[PDB]
């Protein structure tokens, strides 16, 4: 549970001194691009149900063993729980790119859910591939400027793909 | 760590929903705040050492007994003055940290949460720190809306003290 | 009723504390939002009747079977069209209410909270309402940041539907 | 898994007592049920493939738009028909499983518990499955008390759908 | 739990029609003066501990029976609870003038606390006089401007005195 | 090669006469143009690589299908991106060449004269190049009269495309 600003504050307090000037110029540029961060975040957020349905749509086209009887996502209840797990992961990705820090995504999902999927018998590979495909579709949905002014989303495609790869690797 | 973006994420997480336009309103407001608050924090960083010494001298002026009586809680000896001005600089650094963070979170986590029992155990009067914070909020020399919210954070520290 | 000032008061009340600078940041942000959002809500109020008829005609166009088959859920007869366009106007009125309120609260309390079981009991496909909301968000004719957050509310209704 | 012997054991366990004559009444009743229900399940196993194809054809007949419009939820292409008739056979297999188990437990655990959110996420109308189950309960061709309780399970699936 | 905007929304929904134009001009003027309300609220909030200490200071100078042994606020624990009750009332006043509606003040205090003070044996008269004196001191602290751009706090003085009188009358 | 001095010589040659004051007026005008145009061409030479990558990324952003579908005309694979950004740099280099030459001659001889049949034979949409040239003319960052005539050359390329 950290912001960007609280991250700089905690680092400056562990140093024990005041915040240096270059960190303040970095935070000024962050405050200039934080809305920029946000535009992707809102256009990412508005299409979330389409994102998770298309992600499960491609995943269960790709691995039909999960839909097959005896598969892990075969049962209707389990399949609803599967879509719930995916939607939760996407929501915490949107939270982490809202606050601009991966510590919220770590705190809320990562440390426990790997052991949860081991204990449940859930294959970590399929949900890792699903989070990867969902992240690819999310950047693909974010990067297209439909009715939006001309700007630069470079570094924020960098950050969003970082968050999605952190989620997919912590899942394993 | 009560900062606006963190608490917006906490609201959206406890509700179990995605982010809405409410958090984006919170965000354009937070960026509006930080757009002056970061420069005001830099200005306080510049004037910090003289403000610390002036606050310590005003505290010695209003409470002259602390310089006189022998006691390890009082700043009669030199180590009391070193530790004393150290916690003056602690208070000022927490003010700058809350100016950067945009909320009362850093002072609430680094200062406020145990200050009452510490002043109870160590025989420190909180009125000394109230006098020092009053001198700081009088002498910080900012202007405008940055000055008003700086005074807001210092007054919050005062109300948390007594 | 998830509106920003209400949820700020709920945060400050559940924490048990007074209001801080965080809620004032929320407030200058909310006023920034409302300063365009109220005029955009008035403009939607002006264009409302033609938008409702256009959404109903687009829904009849994409799903032509609903005009043809006999069934009280389908709008084959005239009372289906009266009730149908009535709930089109319901959706548009909730969009304007969320534009005024500044959050998704009014649609969440008046539309979303029971819509799934209602469409389950009444054999109403939610895709009809998704098509109508898509036509509205295409044809509302606003511009700029008001248009983006209007599309945000309509997309929120779409994601709550399916 | 709401089956009569399982729920009798759950009653006796939650009460903390031994089995009484109540569970033995439940048992002679359950054996009376199974004494026809197993043969009826075998007869449904025999007629299953033609019932599945007839239900799919009746569903295409009542809802002809699903064969026409392009869409991955609709069975316009061939993979939609493979997956579609697969979930027809799923529904029929769950009916036979509840006929063997003697309670609505297998359909409640394999079908019902998530079907609403699945049809919400995938744009599947449940009325398609209601039409298919109505065709199955019309065309299963059983007779007598086995036919009545088969219709009971299918009507239970219908009421759980809409 | 209502705003000004949610109050107009609930009234317009009970009417069943859209919001009329004159209500929108009223809400536009409210959005213009809402900061005016916010500025007044902030200078009310910053002096809250001084307000409650001066209010109890004048009240226990005024009614020394409460400090007298056997009095309701005599015991140290009870006196701390007394100051806590007053600070809670001031906080919910600040919340109600934040949201611009008395429904939060009603919801959080009013309907129960009269019966609470009856059941406790708390004299409702003294706490009513204390809330009245606290409100008088609060408007007196708000109305003076020090280093603030000139503005009309007068519209608010009406509303703040309304909230304080509602609290004092619901206490009784 | 429609450059002003060349076409002045062509006019004087086709008329069969010597040079007059008209060509000298053309010349002091051309020198007036080149006196800023050469430095503007050097500035475009400096910013060229980042402009090429930004134009390619904007083209992938507005037309996301070209990155996805398999096809040798589309830039799904890596060789499509190498060749693609190569013709982005081709367009930018022709813009700089016309900035130096002082007329639309170099782009007319190196790009325009066959571009229609090439895009016809190769299944290349010219709208991709229109989007890239629009991004370049938005992001070149020049100012003043050099910026206006740079936009003139880019708009000429756009009108020659579609
Ligand atoms: C689909 C992508 C993959 C998949 C998903 C799946 N998950 C479950 C069950 C659980 N998943 C969780 C995960 C979380 N709970 C949390 O609170 C959070 C963070 C906030 C996470 C990430 C938990 C705790 C469970 C068990 C309890 C429960 O109701 O859901 C299932 C069902 C297993 C079952 O037997 O019910 C499924 C199917 N599994 C797959 O097959 C895909 C690879
Ligand atoms: C990102 C993938 C693409 C992109 C985005 C982009 N946005 C801006 C600037 C603004 N975007 C907004 C949006 C909103 N403000 C709000 O309050 C809301 C409601 C929640 C929205 C939707 C606004 C208002 C700004 C700035 C202020 C204004 O526009 O009036 C930029 C440039 C400016 C900036 O950095 O903020 C950019 C680049 N542009 C692309 O090309 C990407 C594909
Ligand atoms: C001078 C300002 C006044 C004064 C100060 C004084 N304080 C102490 C001892 C402590 N002060 C603290 C305070 C903080 N620690 C923190 O980490 C922070 C926030 C970053 C604060 C505000 C603590 C924890 C102690 C105990 C640690 C310690 O004992 O060193 C002293 C030393 C007295 C002592 O032995 O305990 C002094 C002199 N006293 C005065 O007379 C001045 C008016
Ligand atoms: C990326 C910008 C877009 C894209 C481009 C693309 N073009 C080709 C193939 C050719 N492009 C040209 C264009 C020029 N040649 C020139 O000499 C000049 C002026 C100096 C221009 C503008 C030509 C002649 C070809 C054919 C030559 C060849 O085949 O290599 C490709 C390769 C596809 C191909 O086999 O033909 C690509 C990828 N395509 C996209 O998807 C981007 C939007
Ligand atoms: C304020 C928020 C709100 C919404 C959204 C709402 C929807 C709503 N629509 C209903 C019916 C209906 N809804 C539709 C709508 C349609 N059918 C079609 O074929 C068209 C595609 C579509 C036209 C938009 C129709 C025709 C009925 C009447 C069918 C019925 O008997 O139940 C009903 C049942 C009440 C009734 O039977 O009259 C509700 C509660 N009610 C609300 O209070
Ligand atoms: C054992 C109990 C059980 C049931 C009931 C079940 C249903 C089920 N049907 C699905 C899809 C589907 N369901 C249908 C069915 C139809 N669409 C039509 O147009 C026809 C009217 C109808 C034919 C019966 C089709 C065509 C799909 C594939 C569409 C998709 O991508 O999601 C999916 C998503 C999996 C996927 O995408 O492949 C589930 C989980 N799964 C189960 O495990
Ligand atoms: C959020 C809204 C809220 C309110 C308003 C509230 C009032 C409240 N005041 C109480 C006690 C009290 N309230 C008072 C206050 C007063 N008595 C006096 O003599 C004066 C007239 C007045 C000072 C203004 C005192 C002295 C007690 C202590 C009674 C006791 O502990 O026996 C109690 C009994 C439990 C306890 O304090 O620890 C409640 C529930 N509680 C709430 O949760
Ligand atoms: C949450 C942190 C925060 C605060 C505190 C804040 C206050 C604040 N009060 C303002 C204005 C003002 N505030 C007042 C307030 C008053 N004048 C009087 O004479 C009355 C006694 C009193 C009300 C009772 C007035 C009159 C103005 C004039 C400008 C305006 O209308 O906003 C402005 C306008 C912009 C500026 O001053 O730079 C700010 C910033 N803004 C913030 O972001």
Cβ atoms of C139 and C54 closer than 8 Å: yes
* Nearest CA-CA distance, residue A69 and chain D, Å: 10
CA D42-D44-D50 angle, to 5 degrees, is 135
Distance between CA atoms of residues C43 and C46, nearest Å: 5
Residue E118 burial (CB count, 10 A):
11
Close Cβ partners of D100 (under 8 Å, ≥ 6 residues apart): D37, D38, D41
**B and E touching (3 or more beta-carbon pairs closer than 8 Å):** yes
* Nearest CA-CA distance, residue A113 and chain D, Å: 22
**A and C touching (3 or more beta-carbon pairs closer than 8 Å):** yes
The H-assigned helical ranges of F16-77 are 21-46, 48-62, 65-68
Out of C20, C32, C102, name the one closest to residue B103 (CB). Answer: C20
What is the three-class DSSP state of F128?
Answer: helix
Cβ atoms of C21 and B104 closer than 8 Å: yes
- The verdict on the CB of residue F27 being under 6 Å from ligand 4 is no
For the stretch A115-135, what's the b/e string if a residue is b when 16 or more beta carbons lie within 10 angstroms of its beta carbon?
A: eebeeeebbbebbbbbbbbbb
Give the CA dihedral B100, B106, B112, B114, nearest 10 degrees. Answer: -150
Q: Token pair 């088969």 is at which residue?
A: D150
Query: Phi and psi dihedrals of E72, rounded to 5?
Result: -75, -35
For chain D, give the secondary structure using H, E and C: CCCHHHHHHHHHHHHCCCCCHHHHHHHHHHHHHHHHHHHHHHHHHHCHHHHHHHHHHHHHHHCCHHHHCCCCCCCCCHHHHHHHHHHHHHHHHHHHHHHHHCCCHHHHHHHHHHHHHHHHHCCCCHHHHHHHHHHHHHHCCCCCHHHHHHHHHHHHHHHHHC
User: Which H or E run contains A151?
Assistant: none
Residue F29 burial (CB count, 10 A):
12
Nearest-Cα residue of chain A relative to residue F67: A140
Inter-chain CB proximity C151 and A46 less than 8 Å: yes
Query: Phi and psi dihedrals of C101, rounded to 5?
Result: -75, -25
What is the three-class DSSP state of F72?
Answer: coil
* E140 token code pair: 């007196």
Closest ligand 3 atom to Cα of B84:
1
Cβ atoms of E99 and E2 closer than 8 Å: yes
Inter-chain CB proximity B159 and E48 less than 8 Å: yes
Close Cβ partners of E84 (under 8 Å, ≥ 6 residues apart): none
Q: Taking CB atoms and an 8 Å cutoff, what residues of chain A touch D122?
A: 53
Q: Taking CB atoms and an 8 Å cutoff, what residues of chain E touch B156?
A: 46
From the candidates C4, C6, C11, which should be mutated to test the interface with E, based on the most E CB atoms within 10 A?
C6
Close Cβ partners of C90 (under 8 Å, ≥ 6 residues apart): C111
Cβ atoms of C98 and D137 closer than 8 Å: no
Inter-chain CB proximity C155 and A49 less than 8 Å: no
Close Cβ partners of F156 (under 8 Å, ≥ 6 residues apart): F104, F107
Cβ atoms of E63 and E126 closer than 8 Å: yes
Residue C151 half-sphere exposure, CB side, CA atoms within 13 Å? 22
* F146 token code pair: 């050099």
What is the three-class DSSP state of A45?
Answer: helix
User: Which H or E run contains A63?
Assistant: none
Distance between CA atoms of residues C12 and E48, nearest Å: 15
Close Cβ partners of C81 (under 8 Å, ≥ 6 residues apart): C56, C75
Cβ atoms of F103 and F27 closer than 8 Å: no
Cβ atoms of B9 and A95 closer than 8 Å: yes
Close Cβ partners of B76 (under 8 Å, ≥ 6 residues apart): B66, B67, B68, B69, B70
**E and F touching (3 or more beta-carbon pairs closer than 8 Å):** no
* A125 token code pair: 């590979």
Distance between CA atoms of residues E51 and E44, nearest Å: 9
Write out the DSSP string of B43-100. Answer: HHHHTHHHHHHHHHHHHHHH-THHHHS--TTTT-SHHHHHHHHHHHHHHHHHHHHHHH
Distance between CA atoms of residues B143 and B97, nearest Å: 19
Q: Taking CB atoms and an 8 Å cutoff, what residues of chain A touch D111?
A: 76
CA F88-F94-F97 angle, to 5 degrees, is 145
From the candidates A143, A147, A154, A155, which should be mutated to test the interface with F, based on the most F CB atoms within 10 A?
A143
In a 10 Å sphere around its CB, with 0-12 CB exposed, 13-18 middle and 19+ buried, how is residue E22 labelled?
Answer: exposed
* Secondary structure tally for chain F: helices H, strands E: 9, 0
Distance between CA atoms of residues C26 and C8, nearest Å: 8
Cβ atoms of C13 and E108 closer than 8 Å: yes
Chain CA centroid to CA D19, Å? 31
What is the three-class DSSP state of E152?
Answer: coil
Out of B2, B18, B26, name the one closest to residue C26 (CB). Answer: B26
- The verdict on the CB of residue E150 being under 6 Å from ligand 8 is yes
Closest ligand 3 atom to Cα of B63:
43
Name the residue among D93, D78, D79 with its Cα closest to residue D133: D93
Name the residue among E118, E142, E119 with its Cα closest to residue E128: E118
Distance between CA atoms of residues F26 and F10, nearest Å: 13
* Ramachandran area for residue B74 (φ above 0: left; ψ -120 to 50: alpha; else beta): beta
DSSP helix, strand, coil percent of chain A (3-state; round to 5): 75, 0, 25
Distance between CA atoms of residues B5 and B13, nearest Å: 12
Q: Token pair 């691995």 is at which residue?
A: A63
Cβ atoms of F145 and F94 closer than 8 Å: no
Residues in chain A after which the chain is broken, C→N over 2.5 Å: none
Distance between CA atoms of residues A24 and B42, nearest Å: 8
In a 10 Å sphere around its CB, with 0-12 CB exposed, 13-18 middle and 19+ buried, how is residue B86 labelled?
Answer: exposed
Query: What angle, 0 to 180 degrees and rounded to 10, lies between the N-to-C axes of helices B78-101 and B48-62?
Result: 130
Ligand 8 center from residue C7 Cα (angstroms):
23
Residue B31 burial (CB count, 10 A):
18
Distance between CA atoms of residues B49 and B117, nearest Å: 28
Expressed in angstroms, the distance from the first to the final Cα of chain A is 23
* A130 token code pair: 């699903």
Distance between CA atoms of residues A119 and A142, nearest Å: 35
What is the three-class DSSP state of A71?
Answer: coil
Q: How many angstroms separate the Cα of F99 from the Cα of each of F37, F102, F139, F151?
A: 6, 5, 17, 11
- The verdict on the CB of residue F122 being under 6 Å from ligand 4 is yes
* E122 token code pair: 């708390």
Q: Token pair 């006019």 is at which residue?
A: F11
Method used to solve the structure: cryo-EM
Closest ligand 6 atom to Cα of D132:
24
Distance between CA atoms of residues A3 and A107, nearest Å: 13
Cβ atoms of C132 and C70 closer than 8 Å: no
DSSP state of C76: -
């Amino acid at each position: 549970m950290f912001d960007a600003f609280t991250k700089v504050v905690s680092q400056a307090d562990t140093r024990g001194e005041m915040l240096s000037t270059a960190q303040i110029d970095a935070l000024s540029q962050m405050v200039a691009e934080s809305n920029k961060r946000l535009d992707s975040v809102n256009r990412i957020t508005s299409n979330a149900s389409t994102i998770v349905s298309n992600a499960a749509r491609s995943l269960f086209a790709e691995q039909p063993q999960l839909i097959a009887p005896g598969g892990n996502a075969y049962t209707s209840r389990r399949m609803a729980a599967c879509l719930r797990d995916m939607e939760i992961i996407l929501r915490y990705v949107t939270y982490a790119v809202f606050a601009g820090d991966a510590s919220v995504l770590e705190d809320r999902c990562l440390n426990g859910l790997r052991e949860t999927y081991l204990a449940l018998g859930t294959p970590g590979s399929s949900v890792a591939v699903g989070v990867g495909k969902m992240k690819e579709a999310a950047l693909a949905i974010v990067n297209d400027p439909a009715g939006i002014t001309p700007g630069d989303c470079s570094a924020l495609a960098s950050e969003i793909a970082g968050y999605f790869d952190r989620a997919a690797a912590a899942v394993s | 760590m009560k900062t606006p973006l963190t608490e917006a994420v906490s609201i959206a997480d406890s509700q179990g929903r995605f982010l809405s336009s409410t958090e984006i309103q919170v965000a354009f407001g937070r960026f509006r705040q930080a757009k002056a608050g970061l420069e005001a924090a830099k200005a306080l960083t510049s004037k910090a050492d003289s403000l610390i010494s002036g606050a310590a001298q005003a505290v010695y002026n209003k409470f002259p007994y602390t310089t006189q009586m022998q006691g390890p809680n009082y700043a009669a000896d030199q180590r009391g003055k070193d530790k004393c001005a150290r916690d003056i600089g602690y208070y000022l650094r927490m003010v700058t940290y809350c100016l950067i963070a945009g909320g009362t979170g850093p002072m609430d986590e680094y200062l406020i949460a145990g200050i009452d029992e510490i002043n109870r155990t160590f025989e420190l009067s909180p009125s000394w720190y109230i006098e020092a914070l009053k001198y700081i909020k009088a002498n910080h020399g900012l202007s405008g809306d940055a000055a008003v919210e700086a005074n807001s954070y210092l007054d919050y520290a005062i109300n948390a003290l007594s």
